[PDB]
Ligand binder design. Structure first.
Ligand SMILES: CN[C@@H]1CN(c2cccc(OC)c2)S(=O)(=O)c2sc(S(N)(=O)=O)cc21
Ligand SMILES: [Hg+2]
Ligand SMILES: [Zn+2]
Length: 257
């Protein structure tokens, strides 16, 4: 199956998923000088106060924290969006070194990791239906740089022991995602896709200008996960990121000057 290795990495995905070569694929490099400042952009509205996390699991590609998206508990609104988007899960993409890991790049600069808070448009009924629409999902991209520790990430870090191998999951209730947000909500936005197969072009990418910083040992724990299941030969989960795709006939709007 697809993965991030030489024989099943991103440069092979198109063979099983032709959309890999589509017109609005992510991630892309964000050129700060050619991004158009759009004054008609509203501020983002991130309502994560009623967020209910439930479980965290290693799905072979990364660890995911899932939330109870049965009701509008943690929604994203405003910004370039029209409609309410419910939070369903969040994951990370990191590297084997501190100078790579982010999918999106700013002026060709890569960050240690990138957090993705995934939401689906509520006018579509369920996630399954949202993925069949050009405006079905909204993903909040947040870069992570190495520096001081982010206290809000530590709770996630401690539990990685329990989900070391593919398929393992653990209960992860009462987690407040608000602790992983930067001070500023200034963003860049553009229409794109999922960065992993099936590579569907249903996403409105909202990438924040301000990155959060985590410690060296915090991201270190990330690199100790396993792509493989228990028993199989160990394959360290690192560099689970896709390289930037051509921007093509698209424009990146900035919510700031
Ligand atoms: C592996 N695909 C990931 C999980 N998803 C998924 C799960 C079930 C079905 C499906 O499509 C039919 C997609 S997902 O939509 O939550 C996302 S979003 C995303 S990223 N890096 O672009 O943010 C990676 C994945
Ligand atoms: Hg779509
Ligand atoms: Zn992602």
């Amino acid at each position: 199956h697809w993965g991030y290795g030489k024989h099943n990495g991103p440069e092979h995905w198109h063979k099983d998923f032709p959309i890999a070569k589509g017109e609005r694929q992510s991630p892309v490099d964000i050129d700060t000088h050619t991004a158009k400042y759009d004054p008609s952009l509203k501020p983002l509205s991130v309502s994560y106060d009623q967020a209910t996390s439930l479980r965290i699991l290693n799905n072979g590609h990364a660890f995911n924290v899932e939330f109870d998206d049965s009701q509008d508990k943690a929604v994203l609104k405003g910004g370039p969006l029209d409609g309410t988007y419910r939070l369903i899960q969040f994951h990370f993409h990191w590297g084997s070194l501190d100078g790579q890991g982010s999918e999106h790049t700013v002026d060709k600069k890569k960050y240690a990791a990138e957090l993705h808070l995934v939401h689906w448009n509520t006018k579509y009924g369920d996630f399954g239906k949202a993925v069949q629409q050009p405006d079905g999902l909204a993903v909040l991209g947040i870069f992570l740089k190495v520096g001081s520790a982010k206290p809000g990430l530590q709770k996630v870090v401690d539990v990685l022991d329990s989900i070391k191998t593919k398929g393992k999951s653990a209960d992860f209730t009462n987690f407040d995602p608000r602790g992983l947000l930067p001070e500023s909500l200034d963003y860049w936005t553009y229409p794109g896709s999922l960065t992993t197969p099936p590579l569907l072009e249903c996403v409105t990418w909202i990438v924040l200008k301000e990155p959060i910083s985590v410690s060296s040992e915090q991201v270190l724990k990330f690199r100790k996960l396993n792509f493989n299941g228990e028993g199989e030969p160990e394959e360290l989960m690192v560099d689970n990121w896709r390289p930037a795709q051509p921007l093509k006939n698209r424009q990146i709007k900035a919510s700031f000057k």
